[PDB]
C-alpha cells in the first residue's frame, strides 16, 4: 500500500543493542502529491507523487501546467502508488515505523554485455585439458534434427543489469524525522544517488 521515493545514499556500520547491523541510508525527501487518480475519473485508484526538485527554467510549459493543477512546485520525478490516499504531502514520518518490514525497489547497476558465466552462472569449460573454449563460451544450444531451433527465452549472452528490482522484507532500523533519513538493514539494489521506492510490506510473513 503506502510508500515513498528517495535516494540511496550509502551503507555503513551501526550497532543496535549488542550486535553489528549493516544498514543502507536512504533519503526519503518530502514527496508532494501532484495528482489523485480516482478510479471514477480514471479507472483505478492511485496517487502520483513527486521527488527531486527542479528549476522552473528547466521545466516544460506543459509540465508546468501539470504542476499548476495542485500547485506545489516543479519536481523532476513523478511516480504512482496504490491504496495510498492521505491529505497534505508525503513525508516518511507517520508512514514508516522503526521495526516495520518494507519492500525496497530500485534500478540495479547494469553490467552491460556480460557473458553467461556472469549472466546466468553457467560454468564454461576446462582451462587446461586442451581447449579453445576456456572461460565462457556455452556448450550446445539444443538437440539435433529435432526442433532444429533454440528455445524461446533461453540462456545466452545479453545485457545484464539495469533491471527493476524489489527486495522484500527489510527491517526499518532507525528513522530520523526532520532529516528526512531512513536506515534499512541490509542492501538495496542500484547505485548511490540512485532512485529507490520504499513500499509498505506487500505480502509478508
Amino acid at each position: 500500500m503506502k510508500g515513498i521515493l528517495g535516494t540511496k545514499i550509502g551503507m555503513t556500520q551501526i550497532w543496535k543493542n549488542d550486535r553489528a547491523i549493516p544498514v543502507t541510508v536512504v533519503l526519503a525527501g518530502p514527496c508532494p502529491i501532484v495528482q489523485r487518480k480516482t478510479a471514477q475519473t480514471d479507472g483505478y485508484e492511485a496517487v502520483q507523487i513527486g521527488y527531486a526538485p527542479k528549476a522552473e527554467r528547466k521545466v516544460n510549459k506543459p509540465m508546468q501546467g501539470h504542476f499548476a493543477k495542485a500547485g506545489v512546485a516543479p519536481t523532476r520525478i513523478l511516480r504512482e502508488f496504490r491504496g495510498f490516499a492521505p491529505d497534505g504531502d508525503s513525508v516518511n514520518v507517520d508512514i514508516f515505523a522503526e521495526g516495520e518490514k518494507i519492500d525496497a525497489t530500485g534500478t540495479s547497476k547494469g553490467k552491460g554485455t556480460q557473458g553467461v558465466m556472469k549472466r546466468w552462472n553457467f560454468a564454461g569449460g576446462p582451462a587446461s585439458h586442451g581447449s579453445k573454449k576456456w572461460h565462457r563460451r556455452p556448450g550446445s544450444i539444443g538437440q539435433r534434427k529435432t526442433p532444429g531451433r533454440v528455445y524461446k527465452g533461453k540462456r545466452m549472452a545479453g545485457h545484464m543489469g539495469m533491471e527493476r528490482v524489489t527486495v522484500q522484507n527489510l527491517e526499518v532500523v532507525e528513522i530520523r524525522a526532520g532529516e528526512n533519513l531512513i536506515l534499512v538493514k541490509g542492501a538495496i539494489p542500484g547505485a548511490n544517488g540512485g532512485l529507490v521506492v520504499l513500499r509498505s510490506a506487500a505480502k509478508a510473513s
Partner: peptide, 20 residues
C-alpha cells in the same frame, strides 16, 4: 538517477558519529 543537490558525505557522517 535522481540528481538532488546534497552532500552525501556529511549525510553519512551524521548517521555514524553516533556509532564512532
Amino acid at each position: 538517477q535522481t540528481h538532488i543537490k546534497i552532500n552525501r558525505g556529511e549525510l553519512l557522517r551524521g548517521i555514524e558519529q553516533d556509532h564512532t
